[PDB]
């Protein structure tokens, strides 16, 4: 996480539940990354409790969520004068769903009493619409690449830990070394004995 500084327009952390000061010493046994694009005028929509057009329909954040979210400006990558139609979003659905799930089904929406039976007619429209973006928009309509970072604390053996090993060694001096948790003081001296690899 020391490569965190790469971009000048880098946006602030606004981490939820974990302070950025103590991420290095704390260890997470599993890191989950969720990346999808959000328009610039609902960048604050990703928060527990807060609802909207996308919060309860595409990605819901639970109250007991740990991790952080980040965003940056990418208006010169995913924007064209003709218009981008590769990105699609869901708009119509019956109700909200459980957090942490992926929905692929794109069946016809039911709004009226008479069913449409898959025919695009009255009281039934395609719920899947495109992200219409142009390079001449204002400060609130740029495509922002947003990745959601979540962790798990106390659920499995931990391997992901920050670097705490002092980045240097000692020869011919007694120091308070910390060898993977144990603390001791003594001079590191070469030994003529043979040590098995384990």
């Amino acid at each position: 996480y020391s490569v965190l500084y790469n971009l000048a327009p880098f946006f602030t952390f606004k981490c939820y539940g974990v302070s950025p000061t103590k991420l290095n010493d704390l260890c997470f046994t599993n890191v989950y990354a969720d990346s999808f694009v959000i328009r610039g005028d609902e960048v604050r929509q990703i928060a527990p409790g807060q609802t909207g057009n996308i919060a309860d329909y595409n990605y819901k954040l639970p109250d007991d969520f740990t991790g952080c979210v980040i965003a940056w400006n990418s208006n010169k990558l995913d924007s064209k004068v003709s218009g981008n139609y590769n990105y699609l979003y869901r708009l119509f659905r019956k109700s909200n769903l459980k957090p942490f799930e992926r929905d692929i089904s794109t069946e016809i929406y039911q709004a009226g009493n008479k069913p449409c039976n898959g025919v695009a007619g009255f009281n039934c429209y395609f719920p899947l619409r495109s992200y219409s973006f142009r390079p001449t928009y204002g400060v609130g309509h740029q495509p922002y690449r947003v990745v959601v970072l979540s962790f798990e604390l106390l659920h499995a053996p931990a391997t992901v830990c920050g670097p705490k090993k002092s980045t240097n060694l000692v020869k011919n001096k007694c120091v308070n070394f910390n060898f993977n948790g144990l603390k001791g003081t003594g001079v590191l001296t070469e030994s003529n004995k043979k040590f098995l690899p384990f």
Epitope: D56, Y57, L91, R93, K94, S132, Y137, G138
Partner: antibody
Framework: EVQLVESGGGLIQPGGSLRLSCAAS????????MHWVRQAPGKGLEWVSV???????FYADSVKGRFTISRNNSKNTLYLQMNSLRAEDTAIYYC??????????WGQGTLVTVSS | DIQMTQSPSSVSASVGDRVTITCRAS??????LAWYQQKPGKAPQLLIY???TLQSGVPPRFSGSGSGTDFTLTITSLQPEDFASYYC??????????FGGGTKVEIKR
Amino acid sequence: EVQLVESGGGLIQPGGSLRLSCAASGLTVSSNYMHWVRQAPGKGLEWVSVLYAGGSAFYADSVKGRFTISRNNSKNTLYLQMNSLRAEDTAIYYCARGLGDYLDSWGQGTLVTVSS
Amino acid sequence: DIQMTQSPSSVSASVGDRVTITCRASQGIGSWLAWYQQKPGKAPQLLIYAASTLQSGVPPRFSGSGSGTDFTLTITSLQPEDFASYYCQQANSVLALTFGGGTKVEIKR
């Protein structure tokens, strides 16, 4: 084939309680989005309230959440609760539905007049 | 704090004449745009749904499009039945809260 009707409006004292009714002909209220718009005399239309799928609703910034939305799927209608009426609240009310931040079909309208 | 005002306040034009109304936004909004026709005595009716595509039950001669913060609307072959208040509602992406003062058009005598 589709027509929206409103009822229950009339003269009411400030601070009173009244329930509006809006039934959709050929449409299920539990699925689509409904919108509420007001228009006081002398000025234009103004959005009032919107209903999501369930458990969440957003109101105007000037108001302090004085409308509560209750919907029953059995009767296919919508109910609103009047609370904390003021002199500015006197406006015409239109029953509206929306989709994709757009409005297509509006009702004939009902009148609510607060007489201080 | 949307801060939209429709200019000009009122215009006068007749059948065969040229008339247009411009609605601008203080902040940058996308290609989404809509127009409404508000006449007294009854509920207003919509004009278009998308940026350029029209409604099924509206005349095909209504013209209006835009890309930046400025939008405009005009009529090709004016009719006496299209004299009502004009309103603009482009987008808000969260709650669809945008509108202007309005503009009323009258026919000559």
